[PDB]
Design a protein around this ligand. Sequence first.
Ligand SMILES: N[C@@H](Cc1cc(I)c(Oc2ccc(O)c(I)c2)c(I)c1)C(=O)O
Length: 255
Amino acid sequence: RSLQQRPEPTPEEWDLIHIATEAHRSTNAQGSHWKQRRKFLPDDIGQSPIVSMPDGDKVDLEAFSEFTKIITPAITRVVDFAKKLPMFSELPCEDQIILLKGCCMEIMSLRAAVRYDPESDTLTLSGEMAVKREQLKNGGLGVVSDAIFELGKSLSAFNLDDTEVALLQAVLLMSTDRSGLLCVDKIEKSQEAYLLAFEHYVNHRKHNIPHFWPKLLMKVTDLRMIGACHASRFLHCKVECPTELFPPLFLEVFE
Ligand SMILES: N[C@@H](Cc1cc(I)c(Oc2ccc(O)c(I)c2)c(I)c1)C(=O)O
């Protein structure tokens, strides 16, 4: 360890890595059998954008409905992921709440993006619903969909395993650029530990791409950006459409 040229995970990092990975696996829909269980979203759904949005990319109500009918269990599984992480569970529940809201979209988007299928040109939502670029964009997301598609297409070269996704999620979670946090230092400290463990795991993996780590960290920024666009776009939807169309937990996370 450190053994070939680049530092390997420490024993303490191996532990943190194992805990994060299992946290992700146990909360990640349809594990390694998503390619056989997924049903495509019918091609007549997603083609009819008619509710206006401030930026001019309209919303298709039927598609919004399809995506939001399945969103609660998806958000629920991100809450579940976070809770299996000891540095998350031991925070005040105020802090817990703020962190989940700050990273929910980021983690859900990542999870869809790692399930980008090149041959059909689709993302898989919750390991069960394979969607095209147009359907997802028209259903609410607008250009955020082009962003997750663009991220998913570029990640196929990266060959991320379950651990790098889990650690990516954990770094997205433990982030201090949110308003209203109590335990700011404990969070930074916990993020730093994941980042280092992450880096050293990437070292252990020996990817065939040069400069893998900074390339990966740049994919982090893309997610945060996807996250911030969605929070802008969510706010506009809440303005255009009635409450009744939004599942209580969807509202609770993004409102
Ligand atoms: N693929 C994920 C779950 C996941 C689910 C859904 I519904 C998604 O579409 C969204 C999200 C937000 C919105 O505001 C709208 I409208 C749509 C995405 I991107 C991801 C997983 O495996 O957990």
